[PDB]
Ligand binder design. Structure first.
Ligand code: MG
Ligand code: ZN
Ligand code: ZN
Ligand code: ZN
Lengths: 114, 264, 160, 158, 141, 559, 86, 65, 47, 49, 133, 196
RNA sequence: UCGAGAGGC
């Protein structure tokens, strides 16, 4: 009766943007990115990939409410490292690893009989 | 082969594949199983219009059962979301229309399986919409039961969706998942009465890793990288395609992130 | 009864003493019996204490009994609240009970009294006695829907 | 010894020790007259009634008696200098803080303390549950309405 | 055939009832420690025997599995709540026109069954489902 | 009493409540259908006219919207059924009955209302589903549970009414209650067990988890604290990370058992400037206890900081526990072979003791103590013997419980459970009592027709030597049910009796108000207390502190 | 009963402002601001009448008087300016 | 009233296996454990869907209209 | 339905806990556990 | 699966609750109160079947 | 900024207690029979056996947020095998010219007894601790 | 609810991905708090869970009848025969992260009941709805879109706060306020008043 | 509307 339609878990709203980027307060070189219509599937992976960037200082995400499909990701890097570039390189590394995964699995499965 | 994540397949069948994931961090495998569950698209009945129902069941009862029916979705990429297409309600490029009519003519009880579903809409040459049938007797899954003199006549529109909107669009059944069978990483504290080792049973996956020696100190800096998975599919999409399409959908979500970053 | 009393050095020490506990109460005749401490004798029938030891002793023993019945569970209530209850039961002569026979028989307005029990009977008696209500009570203003002189309404506000 | 009283001085002393970074080695700046006259002045600033007459001033001196005892026990010269290590500024700050928290702990007129007492008594009774003395809700019923023929009269003679 | 007898409250003041036929076995160690310790009968002048002690329970309380391991008020609560569970109250629910009726989609016979269930037709018209449950703290909801 | 002392009122709502972390203490989760139904009259001003026009255009069907417009003359405009619901032009001085919006003051309520802490105001947070949502740490002053309980909600209709809800009845204002002069709210079951498991010395966290735990604190300064361990691997301690929620300037000291400043068992609690030095955190530290962390924070920093403290502790601890886990199982009720053997040995020992005392009584060898019958002495001796045996078996069981046992952990943290519960579940449930005595002789000279007459044996009159784990026998089960029925009836009676008592007290003391001279008076003016509480203090702003003059030798007093 | 007032010198009531009179004052001023009544303080982006009344109070620009009543019938008038707020 | 399509917990289809299960029970005189094991139901989440099912539809069919 | 068809009411009922208590004689005749809670507990009983 | 044992009045199913009473025509001895003038009472509620 | 205390201790006994990865250590100074030590150590990271010898050091450095080492770029101030960071919460006078210092590495406690480190261990939260095998 | 008086309501709904999972991929249909267990001493709940686990794995009925020789140890032997831990614990992984849970979880089938109380049947709200003819107060019940009762207990709780104007508004402006004309001499509302 | 019954915290 009061439940929201399930498509709101992945379907952006009227004026909802996918990413909302804001500068962090009382912190240098730190940024808060509100991901809209997302969940732990993306946030955990983005943070785990960001943590392997040796020039990335702080990186963590939180889901402020399980009702709402959205989360916040805070990133802080060294001076001269724009956080948006840190996020871009993380996403590209993710896509590279996933492509290699797909290639190797396809090789193994086509090798596999039955 | 390629530089990065490695896969070694222990066993493979039409219905499930047991394999090993190497050189991957945990978050990747967890997002992979999450996508395999919810983010990969299929096709299932999302509208039912009933003409006559003389059955012992209610209409929405049968409609829910119909939605749960596994339909073919191998060529689902060529199908479009009915919310994305431009037709009025549902076209041939965004939906698959099925018809189901059955009458109780025998004195004995009549069965309505899923094989009694007939596809009215034009497939346009795509391999979708066919009800999956693994019963050795060839009958579909049991949909309803009829007495002599009862009939059920309805039309089912099947659209494209993902599990998050409803669990009917579920490509997979149960994804097995285990890492570190020996608890070498001290990620869980075993509960016990006398002996943790004798009270807990050894996992099947203990064979594929060397046992730790009690004299060895705690290998502490080591992280989790080798996982044991077993992916099972209902039949809407073959297993290999379930995992591959999940990988692709994860790529697609990260790519949408990247394009949003570019357009910022 | 092991009880604490000042040692000659100064610190408190446990010095046990024998105490008599009865299953009946005759305060007067027991108080005068020799061999006892007539200053420390204690009852749980505080009404007899009110009859013998004066009303203030009555209210002290009343608070004592309420404190005991509270601490029997393990809970604690600040002294002010029990003190308020006791001194209200006490303030008017002896012991005014918490019932329609006690406080609800006082001169505490009319509508306040009928808001508890004997409603129509209290109203009849008030019409007969030609009572005049102060309208400074809570229930009087609530019945009239006016702002009762309660907290926020304890004062008037005017301009410079 | 442990009793409920308005101002928690045990916390104010830690507030002063951390606020002013007491080194515990440098000798204090406090002269004895400062400490003594300051405590005695502070007892004069702990107001509960504002009237100026013998009756009201006696009610005032009586109402702050036990708290003044806790105060003198806590702000004692040997204590302030050897147990605490308050400097002059830390001592004046403790004085002002005590006066503030006291004047803050005073009850506010218009408080409906009767309904408050009634609820504070009735609610823990609602959770009352289970040598032959009547206790709990039976004893409370016996007390509230004056019970002539109470179940367990007892006389405790010393 | 004079093999079972009806007894009221007043008559059973003059009799000695055995708890089970095993209390009539002659008595002339290695007992399992996990079985409950039932005292010896300490009596011989038996006139009757209970059919089965579980027959002291009502219809509703016969649904409770292992009611001998629960604090009794919990069994009272459940016996009052079983009368509120949703299930198939009658096979002819579609034919009857009742002011209110609630029917479970897929009722399930319980996996833990009281032997008093068979005579209660519970396994044939159940009112719950065998939900896989996990007792865990998880997000604090 | 039905239409003047109380009445049915407009602008009200009621529904099921359920608990929600990730919700501030003073927040209440209001369903959208309720927010769309309840209205607040807002007069139009240059400060609101844009927001109000937008709300009116939104319409009553979707939220945030409005339902009615009141013009100057007083003619009412129904935005549901009106041709002009689209071309409204709000002139100054008009009224818009707008929807209930976020951060509005509402008067929340749970019944029975025994407390001012049962009717404290809340900030609105409009939520999707159909349940009222409130913070866990507000359950205690409502006595509410999420088992089907309903709650009421009232909406003010005047600016001064909103001011009274926000400045008098607000939740943070009620944290320290005048009853018991202590905080009436605190950390509860999940957060309690989690904060204990987290603040163990054996609890270390890695950097990845630590960063999420940091970010979860809303008022985080953004300074990553230096880890406890550095060289072999950067590791934090649960105490270290939990310290971030504790604001700076907080000092807490408590000693429990052997609480040396070395504290070999991590007892007590020492917190210096918002940083915990040593001690495991449990109910004594973070519960509604007197002199606990909540009392200190509400006294030093203020109410609002204490509510944010509730929120931060809940978020950090619930996160950590979510990724750590917790369960119960039956294995936590099983004692090993040796302990069970000792328990049954103790039970048989108590049985032999009762047998010997009974035979001694049978030969009239009982020297009956002065002031009671022979049979009363016998019954008291047997009851005390059986209770001693039950408590001794329970203590044996609790000794056998390891630290991984989760009911032992719930007892340690103070979340749920007690020694009695462990004793009945694992050792033996014990003696059942009705009307104070043992199981009476309902049948002539016997308890059940399965016993011979004149049997005063332990099992004959209601001693249950079996545990819930081992299972009760039919007679044991009947006696236990006989006791439980008395329990249920005592509950059902005490409820109504205490309700009447409460009503009587409140009607007797209703007009007692502290006047502007501190004279506790009544409607008539008759003085009750010349000084309220005899000192003039509010029951809050009052703490248990020791008087160092009393006690101690005159020698140490002098020194 | 003609005047029954009390001179500002011989005032024995509390100098501090009680939470009850503070709440009544804030509510009355917020009701004034609810209607288009003049505001006597600069607003730094404030629209809620409650916060505007709180800021008017923090700068002591609320020209109201509190008439505290004594039980005999006498009273004491206190300007909001005189009263302290803690 | 009738067999659910898939298991409640994991989603493995079970709707096709009802008649095969009954045939394995009656025609082959098998027991419920091995009868479920042969139908590829290895998780107990799946097994409880078939094993604890009450075919109430056979009672609804007996009603004539 | 079954439990309603086996239900006895004691019309005596203020609360006096002597009739409402589970008497020893109830063994085998009246169910020990099954009874309404709160008011009219024990008075209403089930066979 | 219906068991009967109810009536049908104007479409509504109705059940007669077993009314519990004390058996008549039995002699019971009852002690009177402590302040009572009379000490014991032997009552019989004679009922004609 | 520089080293504040240095010594070499011999371990008397190690007590695990109710904990599974932490141990209580008690050690005596070697060649200076005047100073004793008690410490909560992580036996899971750095194993510690009874009757061992440990080089103990306490520094002041080597405010600002923590950052992990990017590479071998940062020059460590430790050839040691164990390091902790803690706060001083008490200094007690055991005897005349004999002192004891208390430390808390995030809950892991430390007591140090002696009077030859007098004007080194200040009343500062900046306690560092280093331990070499 | 369950068959042991363990009543409760749904507070949240998680999809299978966010739910925790075991190594077999099995996911809980329900999750209950361990804190509801020890205060009630409903051990039969957990014993039923164990017996239902063994019954599902084995394909036999669970003899949960009381007064039998069924013991937790005899059940645990069977459960271990089926390769599971004997007390019902199982390694579970967090769904959000995929990392193992430090605690092992009590996991098994348990017969649960859906009670008659549902929120949309109990939810209710009102603002200036219908009134009663005699009292001119809001009508009773949500079936008539009535108002909630501000009982005298709640009046007392409000008086404890000193919310005077709130009480006046909630007792007059939110219900049955009315205006009457009275004469200063007689003092009763017997005045005839032609307003036009 | 009145009267009655059952149920929830
Ligand atoms: Mg409830
Ligand atoms: Zn289309
Ligand atoms: Zn399954
Ligand atoms: Zn007149």
């Amino acid at each position: 009766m009061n439940a929201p339609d399930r498509f709101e878990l992945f379907l952006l709203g009227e004026g909802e943007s996918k990413l909302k980027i804001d500068p962090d307060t009382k912190a240098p070189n730190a940024v808060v990115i509100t991901f809209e219509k997302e969940d732990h599937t993306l946030g955990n992976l983005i943070r785990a990939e960001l943590l392997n960037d040796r020039k990335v200082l702080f990186a963590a995400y939180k889901v402020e409410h399980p009702f709402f499909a959205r989360f916040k990701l805070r990133i802080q890097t060294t001076e001269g490292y724009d956080p948006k570039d840190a996020l871009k390189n993380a996403c590209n590394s993710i896509i590279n690893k996933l492509g290699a995964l797909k290639t190797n699995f396809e090789t193994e499965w086509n090798l596999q009989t039955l | 082969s390629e530089e990065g994540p490695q896969v070694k397949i222990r066993e493979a069948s039409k219905d499930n594949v047991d394999f090993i994931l190497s050189n991957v961090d945990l978050a990747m495998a967890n997002s992979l199983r999450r996508v395999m569950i919810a983010e990969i698209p299929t096709l299932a009945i999302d509208s039912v219009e009933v003409e006559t129902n003389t059955t012992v069941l209610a209409d929405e009862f049968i409609a829910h059962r119909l939605g749960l029916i596994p339909l073919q979705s191998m060529d689902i990429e060529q199908l479009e979301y009915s919310r994305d297409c431009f037709c009025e309600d549902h076209c041939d490029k965004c939906s698959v229309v099925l018809t189901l009519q059955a009458f109780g003519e025998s004195e004995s009880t009549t069965n309505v399986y899923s094989k009694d579903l007939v596809i009215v809409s034009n497939l346009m040459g795509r391999n979708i919409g066919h009800p999956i049938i693994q019963d050795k007797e060839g009958n579909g899954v049991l949909i309803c039961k009829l007495r002599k003199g009862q009939e059920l006549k309805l039309t089912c529109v099947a659209k494209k969706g993902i599990a998050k909107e409803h669990a009917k669009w579920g490509p997979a059944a149960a994804i097995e998942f285990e890492y570190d069978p020996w608890n070498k990483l001290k990620h869980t504290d075993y509960w016990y009465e006398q002996d943790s080792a004798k009270e807990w049973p050894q996992s099947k996956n203990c064979e594929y890793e060397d046992p730790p020696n009690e004299g060895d100190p705690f290998d502490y800096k080591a992280q989790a990288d080798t996982f044991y998975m077993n992916v099972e599919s209902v039949g809407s999409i073959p297993v290999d395609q379930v995992v591959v399409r999940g990988i692709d959908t994860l790529q697609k979500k990260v790519a949408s992130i990247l394009l949003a970053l570019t357009q910022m | 009864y092991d009880r604490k009393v000042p040692s000659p050095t100064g610190e408190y020490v446990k010095e046990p003493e024998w105490v008599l506990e009865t299953d009946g109460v005759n305060l007067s005749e027991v108080m005068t019996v020799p061999g006892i401490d007539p200053t420390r004798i204690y009852t749980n029938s505080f009404i007899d204490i009110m009859e013998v030891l004066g009303i203030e002793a009555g209210r002290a023993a009343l608070y004592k009994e309420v404190y005991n019945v509270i601490a029997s569970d393990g809970s604690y209530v600040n002294y002010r609240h029990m003190a308020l209850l006791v001194d209200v039961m006490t303030t008017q002569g002896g012991l005014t009970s918490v019932t329609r026979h006690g406080f609800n028989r006082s001169n505490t307005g009319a509508l306040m009294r009928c808001s508890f029990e004997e409603t129509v009977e209290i109203l009849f008696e008030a019409g007969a006695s030609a009572e005049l209500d102060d309208c400074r009570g809570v229930s009087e203003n609530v019945i009239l829907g006016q702002m009762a002189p309660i907290g926020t309404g304890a004062f008037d506000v005017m301009i410079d | 010894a442990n009793w409920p009283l308005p101002v928690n001085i045990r916390r104010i002393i830690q507030n002063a020790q951390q606020t002013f970074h007491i080194d515990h080695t440098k000798p204090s700046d406090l002269t004895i007259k400062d400490i003594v006259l300051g405590v005695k002045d502070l007892q004069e600033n702990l107001l509960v009634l504002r009237g100026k007459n013998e009756i009201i001033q006696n009610a005032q001196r009586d109402a702050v008696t036990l708290f003044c005892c806790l105060l003198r026990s806590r702000l004692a010269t040997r204590r302030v200098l050897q147990e605490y290590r308050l400097t002059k500024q830390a001592f004046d700050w403790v004085l002002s803080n005590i006066e503030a928290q006291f004047l803050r702990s005073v009850v506010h007129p218009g408080e409906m303390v009767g309904v408050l007492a009634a609820q504070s008594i009735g609610e823990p009774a609602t959770q009352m549950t289970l040598k032959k003395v009547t206790s709990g809700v039976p004893r409370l019923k016996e007390i509230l309405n004056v019970a002539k023929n109470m179940k367990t009269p007892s006389l405790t003679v010393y | 055939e004079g093999l079972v007898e009806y007894i009221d409250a007043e008559e059973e003041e003059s009799i000695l009832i055995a708890m089970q036929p095993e209390d009539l076995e002659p008595a002339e160690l290695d007992v399992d420690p996990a079985k409950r310790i039932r005292v010896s009968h300490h009596a011989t002048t038996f006139t009757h025997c209970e059919i089965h002690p579980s027959m002291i329970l009502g219809v509703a309380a016969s649904i409770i599995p292992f009611p001998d391991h629960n604090q009794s008020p919990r069994n009272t609560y459940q016996s009052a709540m079983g009368k509120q569970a949703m299930g198939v109250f009658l096979t002819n629910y579609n034919v009857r026109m009742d002011t209110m009726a609630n029917i479970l989609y897929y009722p399930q016979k319980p996996l833990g069954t009281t032997r008093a269930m068979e005579y209660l037709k519970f396994r044939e018209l159940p009112a719950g489902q065998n939900a896989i449950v996990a007792i865990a703290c998880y997000s604090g909801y | 009493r039905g239409n003047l002392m109380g009445k049915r009122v407009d602008f009200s709502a009621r529904t099921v409540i359920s608990g929600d972390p990730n919700l501030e203490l003073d927040q209440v989760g209001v369903p959208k259908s309720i927010a769309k139904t309840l209205t607040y009259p807002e007069v139009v001003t240059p400060y609101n006219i844009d927001r109000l026009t937008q709300l009116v255009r939104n319409g009553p069907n979707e939220h945030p919207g409005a339902k009615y417009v009141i013009r100057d003359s007083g003619d009412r405009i129904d935005l549901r059924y009106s041709k002009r619901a689209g071309d409204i032009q709000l002139q100054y001085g008009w009224k818009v009955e707008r929807h209930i919006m976020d951060n509005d003051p509402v008067l929340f309520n749970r019944q029975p209302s025994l407390h001012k802490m049962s009717m404290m105001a809340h900030r609105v947070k409009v939520i999707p589903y159909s349940t009222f949502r409130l913070n866990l740490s507000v359950t205690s002053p409502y006595n509410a549970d999420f088992d089907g309980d309903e709650m009421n909600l009232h909406v003010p209709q005047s600016e001064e009414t909103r001011a009274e809800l926000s400045q008098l009845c607000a939740v943070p204002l009620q944290i320290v209650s005048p009853q018991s002069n202590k905080p009436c709210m605190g950390i509860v079951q999940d957060t309690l067990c989690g904060i204990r498991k987290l603040t163990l010395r054996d609890t270390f966290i890695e950097l990845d988890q630590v960063l999420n735990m940091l970010y979860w604190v809303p008022d985080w300064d953004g300074v990553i604290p230096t880890p406890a361990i550095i060289k072999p691997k950067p590791l934090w301690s649960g105490k270290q990370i939990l310290s971030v929620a504790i604001p700076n300037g907080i000092h807490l000291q408590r000693f429990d058992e052997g609480t040396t400043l070395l504290s070999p068992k991590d007892n007590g609690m020492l917190i210096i400037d918002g940083q915990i030095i040593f001690g495991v955190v449990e109910k004594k530290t973070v519960g509604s206890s007197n002199g606990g962390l909540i009392h200190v924070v509400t006294r030093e920093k203020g109410p609002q900081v204490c509510a944010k403290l509730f929120g931060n502790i809940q978020k950090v601890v619930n996160f950590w526990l979510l990724h750590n886990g917790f369960s119960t199982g039956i294995g936590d009720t099983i004692a090993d072979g040796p302990t069970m053997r000792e328990i049954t040995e103790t039970i048989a020992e108590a049985k032999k003791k009762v047998l010997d005392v009974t035979k001694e009584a049978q030969a009239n060898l009982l020297t009956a103590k002065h002031g009671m019958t022979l049979r009363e002495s016998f019954e008291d001796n047997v009851v005390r013997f059986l209770n001693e045996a039950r408590d001794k078996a329970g203590r044996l069981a609790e000794v056998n419980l390891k630290d991984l046992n989760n009911v032992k952990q719930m007892v340690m943290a103070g979340s749920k459970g007690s020694f009695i519960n462990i004793a009945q579940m694992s050792a033996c449930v014990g003696q059942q009592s009705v009307e104070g005595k043992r199981i009476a002789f309902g049948f002539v000279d016997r308890t059940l027709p399965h016993f011979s007459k004149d049997d005063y044996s332990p099992e004959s009159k209601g001693f249950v030597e079996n545990s819930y784990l081992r299972g009760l026998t039919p007679q044991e089960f009947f006696f236990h049910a006989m006791g439980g029925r008395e329990g249920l009836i005592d509950t059902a009676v005490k409820t109504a009796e205490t309700g009447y008592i409460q009503r009587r007290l409140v009607k007797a003391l209703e007009d007692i108000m502290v006047h502007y001279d501190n004279t506790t008076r009544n409607s008539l003016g008759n003085v009750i207390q010349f000084i309220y509480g005899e000192d003039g203090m509010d029951a809050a702003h009052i703490e248990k502190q020791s008087l160092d003059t009393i006690g101690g030798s005159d020698a140490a007093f002098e020194k | 009963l003609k005047e029954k007032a009390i001179p500002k010198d011989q005032r024995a009531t509390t100098p501090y402002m009680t939470k009850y009179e503070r709440a009544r004052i804030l509510g009355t001023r917020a009701l004034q601001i609810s209607m288009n009544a003049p505001v006597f303080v600069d607003l730094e982006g404030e629209t809620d009448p409650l916060r505007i009344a709180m800021k008017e109070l923090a700068e002591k620009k609320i020209p109201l008087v509190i008439r505290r009543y004594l039980p005999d019938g006498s009273f004491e008038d206190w300007s909001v300016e005189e009263l302290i707020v803690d | 009233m009738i067999v659910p399509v898939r298991c409640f917990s994991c989603g493995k289809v079970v709707g096709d296996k009802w008649e095969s299960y009954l045939n394995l029970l009656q025609e082959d005189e098998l027991d419920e454990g091995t009868a479920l094991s042969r139908l590829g139901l290895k998780r107990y989440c799946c097994r409880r869907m078939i094993l604890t099912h009450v075919d109430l539809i056979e009672k609804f069919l007996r009603y004539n209209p | 339905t079954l439990s309603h068809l086996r239900r006895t009411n004691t019309p005596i009922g203020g609360k006096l806990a002597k009739p409402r208590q589970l008497h020893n004689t109830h063994w085998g005749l009246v169910c020990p556990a099954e009874t309404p809670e709160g008011q009219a507990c024990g008075l209403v009983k089930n066979l | 699966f219906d068991m009967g044992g109810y009536f049908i009045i104007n479409g509504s199913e109705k059940v007669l609750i077993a009314q519990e009473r004390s058996a008549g025509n039995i002699v019971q001895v009852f002690k009177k109160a402590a302040p009572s003038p009379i000490s014991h009472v032997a009552e019989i509620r004679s009922a004609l079947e | 900024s520089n080293t504040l205390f240095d010594d070499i201790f011999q371990v008397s006994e190690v007590d695990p207690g109710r904990y599974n990865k932490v141990c209580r250590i008690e050690a005596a100074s070697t060649t200076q029979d005047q100073c004793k030590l008690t410490l909560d150590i992580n036996v899971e990271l750095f194993p510690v056996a009874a009757q061992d010898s440990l080089t103990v050091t306490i520094a002041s450095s080597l405010t600002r947020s923590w950052r992990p080492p990017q590479a071998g770029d940062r020059s460590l101030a430790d050839d040691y095998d164990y390091v902790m960071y803690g706060t001083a919460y008490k200094f007690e006078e055991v005897s005349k010219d004999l002192i004891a210092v208390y430390y808390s590495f995030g809950g892991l406690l430390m007591r140090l007894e002696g009077n030859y480190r007098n004007l080194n261990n200040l009343k500062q939260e900046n306690a560092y601790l280093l331990i070499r095998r | 609810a369950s068959r042991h008086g363990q009543k409760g309501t749904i507070g949240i709904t998680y999809r299978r991905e966010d739910m925790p999972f075991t190594a077999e991929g099995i996911v809980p249909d329900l999750i209950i708090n361990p804190h509801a267990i020890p205060s009630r001493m409903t051990v039969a709940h957990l014993i039923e869970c164990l017996l239902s686990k063994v019954a599902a794995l084995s394909g036999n009925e669970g003899d949960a009848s009381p007064f039998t020789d069924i013991t937790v140890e005899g059940i645990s032997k069977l459960l271990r025969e089926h390769g599971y831990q004997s007390r019902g614990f199982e390694v579970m992984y967090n769904g959000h992260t995929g990392k193992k849970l430090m605690a092992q979880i009590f996991f098994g089938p348990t017969y649960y009941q859906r009670l008659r109380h549902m929120v949309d049947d109990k939810i209710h709200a009102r603002a200036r709805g219908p009134m009663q003819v005699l009292t001119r107060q809001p009508v009773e019940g949500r079936s008539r879109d009535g108002g909630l009762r501000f009982g005298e207990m709640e009046r007392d709780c409000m008086i404890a706060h000193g919310a005077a104007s709130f009480l006046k508004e909630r007792l007059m402006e939110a219900s049955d306020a009315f205006r009457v004309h009275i004469c200063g001499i007689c003092g009763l509302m017997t005045v005839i008043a032609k307003l036009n």
